[PDB]
Each structure stands twice: as C-alpha cells, then as structure tokens.
Amino acid sequence: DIQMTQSPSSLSASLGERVSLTCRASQDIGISLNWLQQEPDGTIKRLIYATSSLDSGVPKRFSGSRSGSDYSLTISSLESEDFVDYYCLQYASSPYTFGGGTKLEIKRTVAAPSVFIFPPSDEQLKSGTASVVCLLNNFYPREAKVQWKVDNALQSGNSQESVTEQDSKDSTYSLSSTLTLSKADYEKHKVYACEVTHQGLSSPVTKSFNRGEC
Amino acid sequence: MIGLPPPRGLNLLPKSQTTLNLTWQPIFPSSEDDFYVEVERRSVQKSDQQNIKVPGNLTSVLLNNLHPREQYVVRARVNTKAQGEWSEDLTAWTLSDILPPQPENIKISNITHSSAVISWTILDGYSISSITIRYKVQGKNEDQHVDVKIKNATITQYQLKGLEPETAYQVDIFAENNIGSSNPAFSHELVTLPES
Amino acid sequence: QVQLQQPGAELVRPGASVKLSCKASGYSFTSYWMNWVKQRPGQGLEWIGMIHPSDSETRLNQKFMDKATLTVDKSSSTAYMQLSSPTSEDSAVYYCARGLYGNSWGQGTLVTVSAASTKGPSVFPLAPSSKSTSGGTAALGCLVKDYFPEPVTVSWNSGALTSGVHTFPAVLQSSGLYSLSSVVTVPSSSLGTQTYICNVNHKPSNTKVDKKVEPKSC
C-alpha cells in the first residue's frame, strides 16, 4: 500500500495569508492525485484533480503543484471559509490511500480562559452519582491542561473533556471537563478543585469549592 | 401450383426514412407463365402489412410509405398461378428521423502507462452507423485530439494505445447516424499511470 | 446537476448486517465507477473499494474483503454497500463518490454500531456560583446526562438567550450513553433578577425538559 505523508497535520494562519500543504508519496504515483476539502459538517468536495487541474467553480486562489514525490496544495490568500480540513488521495495503485489530513484554524491573539467550577446538584446525588464540571470559557490557542484534585489528590481516569469548534465570531475555544464519582466517594471528601494551565495564564489557575459550604 | 424456391441473393436495405429497397438475383430461365414474384412487408412496432407483386424480369423493389425508426419484416415468393414457396424473413430499419442517443454503459478500465480499455453500448433501430472515441489532453491543450472511428456496430470495446504516461485526458464517445451525431455531453476522465 | 443521495445516519445492532444506499441522479448511472470511503469520527479517510454499475465488476481494498459487499440496482440507479457482522470498529461515516477520480461525493451516512437501548436524559442544573464577581460575569448551565442515541438539542429561555451560549459536543461515556453540558455566561448582577431556563429536547425518546437554573439556597 502506498503511503501519503501529509504535512503539516495542523496549521494556524491568518486571513489573507498564503499557505501550502504537502503530501509525499512512498512510491511513484505520477500525477494520479487529488486534493479534497472537508467542511465541518462532513461535506467532501474535490478541489484539484490530477495534481494540478482546478475543478470547475473552485476559486482561483486554490492551486496544486508537484515536485518529485512531493505534492502541494497552495492557497494564495486565505478566506474565512478556507479554515477547514484538507486531504490528498492517491489512485496510482490499489488500494487508493489518503493523506492523513490537515486541519486549518484561524490564528488570533492569545486569550486566557475564564474558569468556573460547578458542584453536583442535590437532585443528582440522590440517584447515587456525582458529576463535577469545570468550564474553560473562550480561550486561544486550543491547547489547555485541566487537572482535578480531590482533597488535594490529583485524579486520573475518571474525567472526560469536550471542546467546542473554533468560534465563528471571535475564533476562541471553550472546553468542559467532567469529573464523575460515586455518591459515596463524593461525600467522603471535602475540597474539589479544577486546576487550569494555558498559555494565556502566566501561572496555573485553580477554581474550587468545599462540599456542603456556600 | 406452382412450387419453386425463392431467390437467394436477397438484400433488404434502407434508402430513406420512408423507403427500403429489396434486391435479388436474376430469374430461373426455364419457363414463365406470365411469371411474377411477390413480396410481403409488415411492421414490428405497428400492425400494418402490404402485399406487392412485381414482374419477374426485375431484381429489386422499393418499399414505400414507411415510417422512420420503424423495423419491418419482409419475405418474397416466386409465383406462377401462383403458390410459390416463401423466402426466409429479412429484417431492416428505416433510417432515423432524429439524432441518435449517446452511447451508454461507458466503462473505462485497465489503465496503464500508455493504454486503457473503453467499452460502451448503443441502442438499436436508430440507424447508428459508427461509434467515435475522441480524446485530448486535459484542458489547456484544446488544440489537437485523436478520434477512433469504429464503423462496425458489432464492436463494443476498444483498447486505446499510445497514450502519454502520467497524463490526464478527456474522453468522449459519440454515435453517428444519417441525421447527425450524439448530442455532446460531459467528457469522461482518464489519467494514465507513470512509467514503471 | 449530479446528485448522490445517502441517508444521514443508521443505527446498527452489533452483529446484524446493514445495507447502505447511495442513490444517483442527474447523470448516466451505468457510465461511471462508484467508490465507497470510510471515515471514523475525527479520523482520516479510507478507501473501501469501487464497483461499476454497468456489469457490477468490483475492486476492493483487501482490508475490507470480508467486511463489505458492493452491489447496484440499475432500475433505481442505486448503489449499495452491505457491511457484515458489524462491530464498534465499523462505526464511521461511509461516503459514495462517482467516477474513477471521485468528481462528485455523497453527503455520507453516519453508522453507529451499538446495543444500547433508547433512553432519555436526566437534566441537572450547573448553578451559578455564590462567589460570582459583584460587577463581573457569572457562568451557569445544564448537565444533560445519560441518553441514547444522538442528538439532543438545548436552548436557553426558549431561544431568547443566544449570546455566550456553549453547548458542548456530547461525549460517549464508558456506560455507552451520551452526556453533554450547555453553559452560558451572563452578568452577575442579573442573577436573582433574570430567570434562566435550559430547554432540552431528546426526540428519540420524546424527552423535553425545561430546567430553571438558579443560585442554590444558602
């Protein structure tokens, strides 16, 4: 199977910037390659056909080119709608194989999250389970670290995270982290804390509560 | 009264949207009656049959008042008074009134660095006389093209040879009849492999 | 206009085969190869194989040899892909795409292989904190726990409250049920004055909840 090594896998750029994606083929594939675009809703569209042919109705700022085993998609000047995902695809040999993709996102200034912690509701505690929620609101860049501490003990294996897609208006992300405990475990401990590390915070920020106090 | 075989060398060919011509060999030179020969033509898509007699001295008749794109069946008899023995059935289509439909079932397969097998189908009864595989290098090279003109409708696939490697072609397939050609459509895509 | 129509989603029970459909229109169905492609959520793409509708010749990625069967139905210009004995590894979006070189794509069918029974969520308040900055911004929300299948929808104040809302993509819990939260940030001054209601709707179970979220008594 031919391997298509697509780099970079993720790329942050600005409006009107010019960027290039590259796939390298593990064996000779000639011109037998397409470039694909994928919208966040999953829609897939062919942009470039056969290495360099621009498909009908694709804006002129997209172009494809080649050099040896290296194949490149170049966007001459980014528009807000171009910050999606891209894949190359070889069909010189079967089975056809795809590059691993490139996710483009919009670069903006660094923004620290505002952090909030939420205790479980009394209603949920009666069902026998407790969820504790940590909210990181409107930060940039995407990378962030959230650690849970119960009576100062770092937790592992019992939390799940969810991150929003880059916001279409202010280009930030938000993230939730949910700690799930049995009611018995939640009630034998006092201090619940979310500790957040992020490029826009010059030190880790901790939000916390004591169970049963206001 | 009277039994005699039919004439071989029997030809039934279209001559227009409304007429077909039937020919055969010269007569048996032994006796005549007055001698006559008769011919029967019937439509397949419709129910209309006509009976004709033409003097034995001749070798052809011209069926007339037919309809375009309609298939007919004909047979003929050598008759004395008369009761000749019937010919075998001949089939033929009037020439079409319309352009022929595009070829269908187009399949492109077995692409190499220089060749590719293309197959297709065409509909009967449109007087299609030839198929043409045309190809050109993708896009900006719209200055030259190759045409393979296949005049034998019995043929349904052809191996294109002598193509440039790692090259992208647009391929088109037309059908031609008395009226004109396939209405053009979108070209197929074909990308040859690099040389191994 | 070429059009390849695939259903948006299919729920599939583990082990029970499923037949995915791709209906072609606006072009000569028997004149173009048809490809199938697999994409795991958040993952890359994988070519499964292709089939020519004219005579149903098929070429398959050997990886799927014992997983997928490609067929066509000429009279309905539909191409089908059947997946046998599905497991959780088969959950993914499956695309069809026309032509040797994929010049038109269907929208894809999201296949979810799961034995989970349909189940409505519980909704719990994420109450705004009693330490909210006097002159600042407070946050509050709703926790929407333990439902199946996707989707659920959430609004705030019957749709009047729009700005500052974040409804997170659901996570699949180790239990096989989904969970998500929806949050909003609002003026701290407005707590106790403005009512805040999250409107939760899970159609597959006809659960609809309106949970008022207020600061806790203390």
Residue numbers in the entry:
A (entry chain B): 1 to 214
B (entry chain E): 540 to 735
C (entry chain A): 1 to 218
Quoted from the paper:
Tie2 is a receptor tyrosine kinase (RTK) specifically expressed in vascular endothelial cells (ECs) and some hematopoietic stem cells and pericytes. Tie2 possesses an extracellular domain (ECD) for ligand binding, a single-pass transmembrane domain, a cytoplasmic protein tyrosine kinase domain, and a C-terminal tail. The ECD of Tie2 forms dimers via its membrane-proximal Fn3, regardless of ligand binding. Here, we develop a human Tie2-agonistic antibody (hTAAB), which targets the membrane proximal fibronectin type III domain of Tie2 distinct from the Angpt-binding site.
The crystallographic asymmetric unit contained a 2-fold symmetrical, hetero-tetrameric hTie2 Fn2–3/chimeric hTAAB Fab complex (2:2 stoichiometry). Two chimeric hTAAB Fabs were bound to the lateral side of each hTie2 Fn3 domain at about a 15° tilt with respect to the plane perpendicular to the 2-fold axis (right). Chimeric hTAAB Fab binds to hTie2 Fn3 through a large interaction interface with a total buried surface area of 897.5 Å2, consisting of ~57% heavy-chain contacts (512.8 Å2; dark orange) and 43% light-chain contacts (384.7 Å2; light orange). A-region interactions are mainly mediated by ionic interactions and hydrogen bonds between the hTAAB heavy chain (HCDR1 and HCDR2) and the hTie2 Fn3 domain. In the B-region, HCDR3, LCDR1, LCDR2, and LCDR3 of hTAAB cover a wide surface of hTie2 Fn3 through hydrophobic interactions, with a total buried surface area of 413.5 Å2. Residues I647, I650, A707, V730, and L732 of hTie2 Fn3 form a network of hydrophobic core interactions with residues L100 and Y101 on HCDR3, and I31, Y49, A50, Y91, and A92 on LCDRs (bottom left, and 3d). These hydrophobic interactions are stabilized by neighboring C-region interactions, which include hydrogen bonds and electrostatic interactions between hTie2 Fn3 residues (Q677, E705, and E728) and hTAAB light-chain residues (S53, R66, and R46), respectively (bottom center, and 3c). Although most hTie2 Fn3 residues involved in hTAAB interactions are highly conserved among various species, the hydrophobic valine (V730) of hTie2 at the center of the hTAAB binding interface is substituted with a long, charged side chain (arginine) in mouse and rat, explaining why hTAAB cannot bind mouse Tie2 (right). The wide buried interface (704 Å2) between Fn3–Fn3’, their low solvation free energy gain of -4.7 kcal/mol (Pisa server analysis), and the consistent V-shaped configuration of Tie2 homodimer regardless of the presence of hTAAB imply that specific interactions between homotypic membrane-proximal Fn3 domains contribute to ligand-independent Tie2 homodimer formation. However, we found that the distance between the two C-termini of Fab heavy chains in the hetero-tetrameric hTie2 Fn2–3/chimeric hTAAB Fab complex is greater than 170 Å, suggesting that the two Fabs that bind to a homotypic Tie2 dimer are derived from two different IgG molecules.
